[PDB]
Amino acid sequence: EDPQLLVRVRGGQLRGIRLKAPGGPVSAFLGIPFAEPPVGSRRFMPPEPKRPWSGVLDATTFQNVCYQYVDTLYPGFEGTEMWNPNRELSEDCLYLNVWTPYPRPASPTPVLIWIYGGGFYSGAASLDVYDGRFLAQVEGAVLVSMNYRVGTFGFLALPGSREAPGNVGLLDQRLALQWVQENIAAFGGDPMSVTLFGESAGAASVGMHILSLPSRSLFHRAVLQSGTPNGPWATVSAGEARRRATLLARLVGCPNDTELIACLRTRPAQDLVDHEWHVLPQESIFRFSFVPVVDGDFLSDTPEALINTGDFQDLQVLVGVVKDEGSYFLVYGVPGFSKDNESLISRAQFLAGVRIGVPQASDLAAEAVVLHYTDWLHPEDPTHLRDAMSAVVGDHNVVCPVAQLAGRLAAQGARVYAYIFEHRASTLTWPLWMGVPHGYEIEFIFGLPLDPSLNYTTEERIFAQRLMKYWTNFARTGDPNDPRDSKSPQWPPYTTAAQQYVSLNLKPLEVRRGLRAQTCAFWNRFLPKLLSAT
Amino acid sequence: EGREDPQLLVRVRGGQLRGIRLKAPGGPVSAFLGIPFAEPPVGSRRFMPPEPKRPWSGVLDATTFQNVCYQYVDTLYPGFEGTEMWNPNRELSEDCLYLNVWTPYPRPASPTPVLIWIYGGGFYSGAASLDVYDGRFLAQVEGAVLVSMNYRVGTFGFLALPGSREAPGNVGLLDQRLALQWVQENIAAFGGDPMSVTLFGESAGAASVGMHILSLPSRSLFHRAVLQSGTPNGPWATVSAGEARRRATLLARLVGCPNDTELIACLRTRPAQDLVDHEWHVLPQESIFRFSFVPVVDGDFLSDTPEALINTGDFQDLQVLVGVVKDEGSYFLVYGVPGFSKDNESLISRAQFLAGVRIGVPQASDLAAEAVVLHYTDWLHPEDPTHLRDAMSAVVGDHNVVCPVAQLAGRLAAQGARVYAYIFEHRASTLTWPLWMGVPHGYEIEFIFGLPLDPSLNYTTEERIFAQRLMKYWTNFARTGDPNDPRDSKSPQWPPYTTAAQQYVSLNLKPLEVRRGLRAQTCAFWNRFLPKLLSA
Ligand SMILES: *[C@@H]1O[C@H](CO)[C@@H](O[C@@H]2O[C@H](CO)[C@@H](O)[C@H](O)[C@H]2NC(C)=O)[C@H](O)[C@H]1NC(C)=O
Ligand SMILES: C[N+](C)(C)CCOC(=O)CCC(=O)OCC[N+](C)(C)C
Ligand SMILES: C[N+](C)(C)CCOC(=O)CCC(=O)OCC[N+](C)(C)C
Ligand SMILES: *[C@@H]1O[C@H](CO)[C@@H](O)[C@H](O)[C@H]1NC(C)=O
Numbered sequence A: 001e002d003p004q005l006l007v008r009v010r011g012g013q014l015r016g017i018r019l020k021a022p023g024g025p026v027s028a029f030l031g032i033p034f035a036e037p038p039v040g041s042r043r044f045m046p047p048e049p050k051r052p053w054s055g056v057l058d059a060t061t062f063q064n065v066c067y068q069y070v071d072t073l074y075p076g077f078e079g080t081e082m083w084n085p086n087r088e089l090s091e092d093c094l095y096l097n098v099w100t101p102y103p104r105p106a107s108p109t110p111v112l113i114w115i116y117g118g119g120f121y122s123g124a125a126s127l128d129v130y131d132g133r134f135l136a137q138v139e140g141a142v143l144v145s146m147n148y149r150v151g152t153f154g155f156l157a158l159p160g161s162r163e164a165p166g167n168v169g170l171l172d173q174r175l176a177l178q179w180v181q182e183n184i185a186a187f188g189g190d191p192m193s194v195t196l197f198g199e200s201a202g203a204a205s206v207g208m209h210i211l212s213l214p215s216r217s218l219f220h221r222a223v224l225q226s227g228t229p230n231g232p233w234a235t236v237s238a239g240e241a242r243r244r245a246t247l248l249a250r251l252v253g254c255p256n257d258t259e260l261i262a263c264l265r266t267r268p269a270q271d272l273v274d275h276e277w278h279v280l281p282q283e284s285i286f287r288f289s290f291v292p293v294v295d296g297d298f299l300s301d302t303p304e305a306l307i308n309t310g311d312f313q314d315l316q317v318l319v320g321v322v323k324d325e326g327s328y329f330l331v332y333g334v335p336g337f338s339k340d341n342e343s344l345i346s347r348a349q350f351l352a353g354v355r356i357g358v359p360q361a362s363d364l365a366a367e368a369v370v371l372h373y374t375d376w377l378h379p380e381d382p383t384h385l386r387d388a389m390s391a392v393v394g395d396h397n398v399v400c401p402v403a404q405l406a407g408r409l410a411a412q413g414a415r416v417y418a419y420i421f422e423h424r425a426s427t428l429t430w431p432l433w434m435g436v437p438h439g440y441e442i443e444f445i446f447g448l449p450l451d452p453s454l455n456y457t458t459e460e461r462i463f464a465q466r467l468m469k470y471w472t473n474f475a476r477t478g479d480p481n482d483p484r485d486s487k488s489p490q491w492p493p494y495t496t497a498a499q500q501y502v503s504l505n506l507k508p509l510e511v512r513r514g515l516r517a518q519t520c521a522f523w524n525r526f527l528p529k530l531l532s533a534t
Numbered sequence B: 001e002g003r004e005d006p007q008l009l010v011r012v013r014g015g016q017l018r019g020i021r022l023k024a025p026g027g028p029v030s031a032f033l034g035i036p037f038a039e040p041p042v043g044s045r046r047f048m049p050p051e052p053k054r055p056w057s058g059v060l061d062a063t064t065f066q067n068v069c070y071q072y073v074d075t076l077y078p079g080f081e082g083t084e085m086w087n088p089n090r091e092l093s094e095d096c097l098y099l100n101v102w103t104p105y106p107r108p109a110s111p112t113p114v115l116i117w118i119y120g121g122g123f124y125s126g127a128a129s130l131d132v133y134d135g136r137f138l139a140q141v142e143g144a145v146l147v148s149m150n151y152r153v154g155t156f157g158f159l160a161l162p163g164s165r166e167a168p169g170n171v172g173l174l175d176q177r178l179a180l181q182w183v184q185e186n187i188a189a190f191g192g193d194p195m196s197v198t199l200f201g202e203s204a205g206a207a208s209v210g211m212h213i214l215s216l217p218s219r220s221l222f223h224r225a226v227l228q229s230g231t232p233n234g235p236w237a238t239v240s241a242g243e244a245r246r247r248a249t250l251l252a253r254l255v256g257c258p259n260d261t262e263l264i265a266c267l268r269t270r271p272a273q274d275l276v277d278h279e280w281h282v283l284p285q286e287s288i289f290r291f292s293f294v295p296v297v298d299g300d301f302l303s304d305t306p307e308a309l310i311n312t313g314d315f316q317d318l319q320v321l322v323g324v325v326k327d328e329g330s331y332f333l334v335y336g337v338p339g340f341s342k343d344n345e346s347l348i349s350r351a352q353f354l355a356g357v358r359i360g361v362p363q364a365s366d367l368a369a370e371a372v373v374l375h376y377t378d379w380l381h382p383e384d385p386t387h388l389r390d391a392m393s394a395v396v397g398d399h400n401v402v403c404p405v406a407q408l409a410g411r412l413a414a415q416g417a418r419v420y421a422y423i424f425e426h427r428a429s430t431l432t433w434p435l436w437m438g439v440p441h442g443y444e445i446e447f448i449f450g451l452p453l454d455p456s457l458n459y460t461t462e463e464r465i466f467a468q469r470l471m472k473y474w475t476n477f478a479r480t481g482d483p484n485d486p487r488d489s490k491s492p493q494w495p496p497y498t499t500a501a502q503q504y505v506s507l508n509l510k511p512l513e514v515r516r517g518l519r520a521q522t523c524a525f526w527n528r529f530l531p532k533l534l535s536a
């Protein structure tokens, strides 16, 4: 019995496992329950706190993945399978993981809490890319990650109902946050220095915690990677959540809300997942059936309204995007695209793809997108059209929403730092045309290139080490720069005047100005004016 | 005759003429100035198509420029060469339908290509007699025969009660056409080749050239065309029958004139100046680069709209040269946009930019105007008064000239025409407008006509060489339909504009540089997006 691996938390005693990191050991406590299992009558309901337990709970292994859809577009392919569940699926999935230095930190250490992405329909904290050991060992950080409910289980809502109120996956995350405030000191973590970080739907999640008052006493800083609470996909209205929940119910033979929710609770988990992708209003990509709802509770108003009227004075945010945010999504619905060819498309296929990639756009608004993204010197060139399609989807769904948030936060007191991530992993199994796809910065921030068995280059290991420092410097101080340092390319704050951000690549930091400024003016200022007049 | 220079006596269809021996820097030229080509369009003839000039007895003196057609005279900046250089240099009269001819001295032995200049000035102003249109240098240096005609402007050329007999519209264009007919019948008397006539003009003059391309009866009267900083398509060069009628009727009321015959009859009783004094009061909006009396789509001279005609036309037999100056819009901003002045830097605010766009794009809805502001904003510096000033210039220039030209060039190329496109980017060293205005509308003309060759004018040596290059491109085009010299292979070549490659050349002090896409993205905005917005 190694006393470093034995911790007492409020609910009882835990035994962790000593893991090997490249430069030394780390203590890991995996599969710690933070809620009562949300099963049977507790499906669709807010999480309840975990009852205390007897003896010593075994926290040496990852727990089950929340019940979710599993991707089958390309069986066996690493590019898709690296995001699929790696533990058994279950509705009993509300557990969290903690990595700490070995021996445990002498003095209180900054805490980073990772919230995974996956469209609010998928994801798990057990995926290898989310491995906290490298950050623990190298940076001395305490790293925490939680499972939260996804799909119908986390986000099906009959708004105003007592028994399916909506947003329960966000309340799962909040309970884990509450757990960290109460327990993280036992691991050497500093509960007065918690940084949320996440990617895609996890970044949207982080933003929702910034915009929900109860969450704000549970952290101090935030990192939003490739995702925002504002934007086209991260929220639905109460009417539209009700519509989808009602249509899903109908699809599974169910059945007054009480009666409808009750019948849904009798259905096997897979029966719900079976009909998950039949409730969307259009043929679309980058669109997810069950997501956070503007309920007037967790979210007091729309994220747009909230970001425009918020006071962000004692907040620090790190935000950014990858170079090719849209590319990944094109192979999942747009005719002409595939990982297995160069996806050189016709102009006809481009016009069609815009209707799928901007599914809420009217005929005129779709036409304005096509005209803006056409290179009128090469209007029919298949490479330009393919790359333009990627751009439309990435800009609409991620870059322009990020730019808009960055600017509101900055304008309203927040200290903001922005980046574009431009390095394509040498190990990537997706084709060259997709570039630096959505999700492929995470492995560098988590420090996976430091594991020499993973076949990254020496430059990537050095690069990962740089990114780990920025993120953990930010966690420590709300500033990604070194306090004592190498020095003379400093990462400057993003402001609404200068609009400075940095390129994250194998070369030293480069400061640029304007995150797609002209194009995001199109999406953020023109298109809203268009369809609100028309 | 007897004691008189035998090289200056020529007979045309109407009778005998006496010209004048003028000095060009390189040697003498012959000029026959003030040749009547129509009956004076005065009295009962006002607003009516021109009648060909009846023959005269004796020898008509063709030694001086004749009267300028009655017109508005610019008052904005009195005594200032920037404005005065375009103002009338002879007395104003409705008796003004004269044309001018310049030829080598002695007149060429074998038939020479003819260039016909059609001046600009909004269809409300202009004269063939301005110094800037002086044909002596082209005649002397290139051996060209150059013709320039006066045509009626303002109400006198373009006021229309469409469908009427007494005021059918387009009569100023009919004046231009009669001159083209005159050249056909008569230019051989001067050594010009009637089977090789190339038109050219700037602004309204270029719109006019394009209307002759688009009008059947004019097509037999010339062989190649050159349109500088203007087009028949676009927002300002024509008006619908209904808008022409509305403007004519409003003007009539304003001068105290109530049946079209009765209305037009009463208009003919009014002093020419009364008409001029009210012509600016009939535009539908507060605007710039908009002109009250302009060609009308009558279903006669213009059988449909220029847009329809350029889209459905067969131009296989057409060789055309078209282009633009670097700063088409700057000039116009000082005649209407609050914030702008020739006497300061015109650093405007964002509020002044939005205001100006309403004036610069007068026919735009609120949504269209905001699309323009959003497109032209530098979102890295949205409040910077230097960019705002220059975006205001660009809006006006792109909407009214650059994108219509891009448009025309593409339709013509797509439909068989051999097209050559340029952008002119040299700012004359003698320009009196402020630097912020760049290379403004009309300031290439003096180089094409060769004024820098006159040492009394104080241009640089480099500017003289550059003028000689341009005169060669223009006359080579006139001669052959190709502005390149066949023997000179060392100089860089000017390639034709095509839809595939969209090539065009920069005209400046440096050798020709080929560029691709004449403002392709922005003109997609004006030519493809806004039209689709309009339908909704
Ligand atoms: C440059 O000169 C112009 C011409 O007078 C000035 O324009 C005026 O600006 C004021 C203040 O904004 C307005 O009230 C007027 O409407 C403008 N006059 C007109 C009719 O153009 C301009 O202010 C000058 N620039 C500076 C700062 O010296
Ligand atoms: C982003 N990530 C790297 C974390 C995981 C990749 O997941 C996707 O398949 C992206 C495409 C997608 O969202 O598909 C959902 C639609 N569906 C369910 C029909 C596949
Ligand atoms: C022939 N040129 C274009 C080289 C010079 C034209 O000069 C102008 O007046 C341009 C400004 C203008 O069109 O004035 C219109 C307003 N108005 C009529 C009141 C003077
Ligand atoms: C690329 O691959 C996809 C999938 O089979 C196919 O539908 C598409 O037409 C292909 N394109 C070309 C032109 O090879």
Ligand SMILES: *[C@@H]1O[C@H](CO)[C@@H](O)[C@H](O)[C@H]1NC(C)=O
Pocket: B456, B457, B458
């Ligand atoms: C040109 O320069 C001369 C020589 O200094 C000067 O005296 C003359 O007035 C100038 N004329 C013009 C046209 O500017």
